[PDB]
Fold Chaperone protein ClpB.
Amino acid sequence: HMEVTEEDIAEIVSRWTGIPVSKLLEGEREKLLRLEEELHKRVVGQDEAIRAVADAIRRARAGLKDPNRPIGSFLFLGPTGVGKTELAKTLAATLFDTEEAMIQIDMTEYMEKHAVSRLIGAPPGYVGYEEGGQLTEAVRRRPYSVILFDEIEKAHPDVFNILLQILDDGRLTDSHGRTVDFRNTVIILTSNLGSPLILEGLQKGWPYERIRDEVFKVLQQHFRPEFLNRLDEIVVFRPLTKEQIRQIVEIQLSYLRARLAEKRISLELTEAAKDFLAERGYDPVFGARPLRRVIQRELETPLAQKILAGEVKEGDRVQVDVGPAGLVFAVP
Ligand SMILES: Nc1ncnc2c1ncn2[C@@H]1O[C@H](COP(=O)(O)OP(=O)(O)CP(=O)(O)O)[C@@H](O)[C@H]1O
Ligand SMILES: [Mg+2]
Ligand SMILES: [Mg+2]
């Protein structure tokens, strides 16, 4: 029907039921473009992680999974800054229409004995009883959510046990005795464990065998089969290739190009200029975390100066290259 669209009808049903539009339309959304391709618009590489997530969602939709557990659960190992959160955010926006559907719990904030009360609510008779838990209240308000637990090995054992309850039961009972349904959640657990150790061993000149033995020993110390067996998949994120970093540079320039387009200004970067940003914006210690401020300092700031001086004007095609002091700008 031309005048009344699929989205029009889904929005009515969405507001009446609380079910996200993209969830109601899951059968149409996948016809438009497959989930993997949609996630890859924002997530570069990490093909294995994307396939793991998409495969779980597919098994769930097809009616092959336990209806009393979450949609899927994953442990994302490997280094920092190479897409674990980029994937969780994109997944939330794609499945549930907004990044507000991603609930983030940083386990470095849940290391102590009283963390459970922060997580699921203080007991009756203790300060903070009416406020409830950070996790339980968030999931009650948004049953259709991606839940990101960061640095899971750091959680106090009592907090870890509540995670296990989510995996096993598909639900939690909060301090008010209310049940909190997790059946429509996707659970993503992250850990860096082993990555700093590898960098340390490479720095010290350790033989590969020694590095390898130490990584497995630390993983064994924190992650037992009883826990791992509960998960759909364990995925080790990989360091990014040179080409992958370049693709990320281009994505991270999207907003800037858009702002410039309002004034009919465009940017044309030499391959050298692109590589300049890629080199400074990525390293093994922080992944691509540095890139945002590299673009800010190396490109946006001097471009801003040129614009304010009137050296770059409305309608200009700006050529961006490398010079002795940093990026250089030319206009024909
Ligand atoms: N695979 C990828 N695809 C697209 N962008 C990526 C990417 N990996 C990293 N980035 C970029 O670098 C930033 C850091 O990525 P991300 O937040 O996914 O890492 P992370 O969750 O491991 C950091 P932390 O350990 O602090 O949580 C992202 O915001 C994004 O701009
Ligand atoms: Mg993160
Ligand atoms: Mg963190």
